[PDB]
């Protein structure tokens, strides 16, 4: 394994980003806020908050060399990034220490200049040096042999705004007011015992999630410390609600994280607030009932849309709850691990 970093184009330099430094974390926020993923028509761009990036990028076992930035030599402007975080991954009959690759991003001015290939080779090298030789990642780009392919679905919470910014459109013979009526939700959840997750809930959430994930073919394997990190509620980042039965025992939970998108060209609407279905576990509450209450809670918290993939058991509630299929397709890839492809309903892994 090569011990020196791979050579960058002249005028560019490697810099590991200290996300515990507020200035540097804002530098990464700015890079992603201005250059990260857009929709096909360049109307929306992800707007990961600084506090979200710190949550996504420093889970248990994070390493500083795995927060891999590129800067302009003369000005020190941040112009490239890629990240890896450790994760224990179950894939069919095997559970293996891998990394999750995320947030690959090159400044718009620097594209088509073969920087992203180097970012990928360098993070690969830095992961190899830790003895880890597999990775999981997702992308919209179709690379060869995805282990799985999921599609986005969208549940309109604020339909007028979505239609106005052209995130959505009126269906045939539909009108604005009739669409608002169609997507109307109850104002309070209906499941008895539903409440935000607390510290005391960490062990039961861990046990519930570990037993529930076993039925899928690609899942995380989380310690209790990782459960605490990924699920303990943090306002405007991660929401988790547990169902406590009449004897005081948690039987189900739901979770969704906060990922808004900049709206580039609308005279009045500047941001699209989206909720992303994370992990949802049911053993006593029907999943349909669980997700109906997820929609209600997201609506209450001012989200404009609730987003979900067709993975795990989601297809059992997507249409019944008036999700509309999106135009986006998400491929899951495993690096240096051959195995058969699987349907979306056997994928049990959600990245940020």
């Amino acid at each position: 394994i090569r011990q020196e970093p791979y050579t960058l184009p002249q005028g560019f330099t490697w810099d590991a980003l200290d996300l515990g430094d507020r200035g540097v974390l804002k530098e990464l926020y700015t890079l992603l806020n201005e250059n990260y993923v857009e929709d096909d028509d360049n109307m929306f761009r992800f707007d990961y908050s600084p506090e979200f990036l710190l949550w996504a990028l420093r889970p248990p076992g994070w390493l500083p060399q795995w927060h891999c930035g590129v800067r302009v030599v003369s000005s020190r402007k941040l112009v490239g990034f890629i990240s890896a975080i450790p994760a224990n991954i179950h894939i069919y009959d095997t559970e293996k220490k891998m990394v999750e690759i995320n947030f690959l991003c090159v400044h718009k001015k620097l594209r088509s200049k073969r920087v992203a290939p180097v970012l990928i080779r360098e993070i690969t090298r830095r992961v190899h040096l830790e003895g880890i030789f597999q990775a999981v990642y997702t992308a919209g780009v179709v690379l060869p042999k995805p282990v799985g392919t999921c599609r986005y679905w969208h549940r309109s919470l604020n339909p007028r705004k979505l239609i106005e910014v052209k995130f959505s459109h009126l269906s045939r013979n539909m009108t604005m007011q009739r669409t608002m009526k169609l997507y109307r939700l109850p104002e309070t959840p209906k499941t008895a015992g539903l409440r935000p997750m607390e510290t005391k809930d960490i062990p039961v959430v861990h046990q519930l999630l570990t037993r529930y994930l076993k039925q899928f073919h690609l899942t995380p394997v989380m310690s209790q410390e990782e459960v605490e990190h990924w699920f303990y509620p943090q306002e405007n980042i991660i929401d988790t609600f547990v169902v406590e039965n009449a004897n005081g025992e948690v039987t189900d939970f739901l979770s969704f994280y906060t990922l808004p998108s900049t709206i580039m060209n609308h005279p009045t609407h500047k941001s699209l607030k989206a909720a992303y279905s994370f992990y949802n576990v049911h053993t006593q509450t029907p999943l349909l009932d669980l997700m109906s209450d997820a929609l209600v809670l997201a609506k209450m918290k001012g989200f404009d849309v609730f987003n979900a993939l067709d993975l795990m058991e989601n297809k059992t509630f997507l249409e019944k709850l008036k999700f509309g299929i999106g135009d986006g397709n998400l491929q899951y890839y495993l690096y240096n691990w051959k195995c058969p492809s699987m349907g979306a309903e056997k994928v049990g892994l959600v990245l940020q």
Binding site: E38, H154, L330
Partner: peptide
């Protein structure tokens, strides 16, 4: 997170 999808 990797794809900014909208309604189809």
């Amino acid at each position: 997170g990797k794809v900014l999808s909208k309604i189809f």
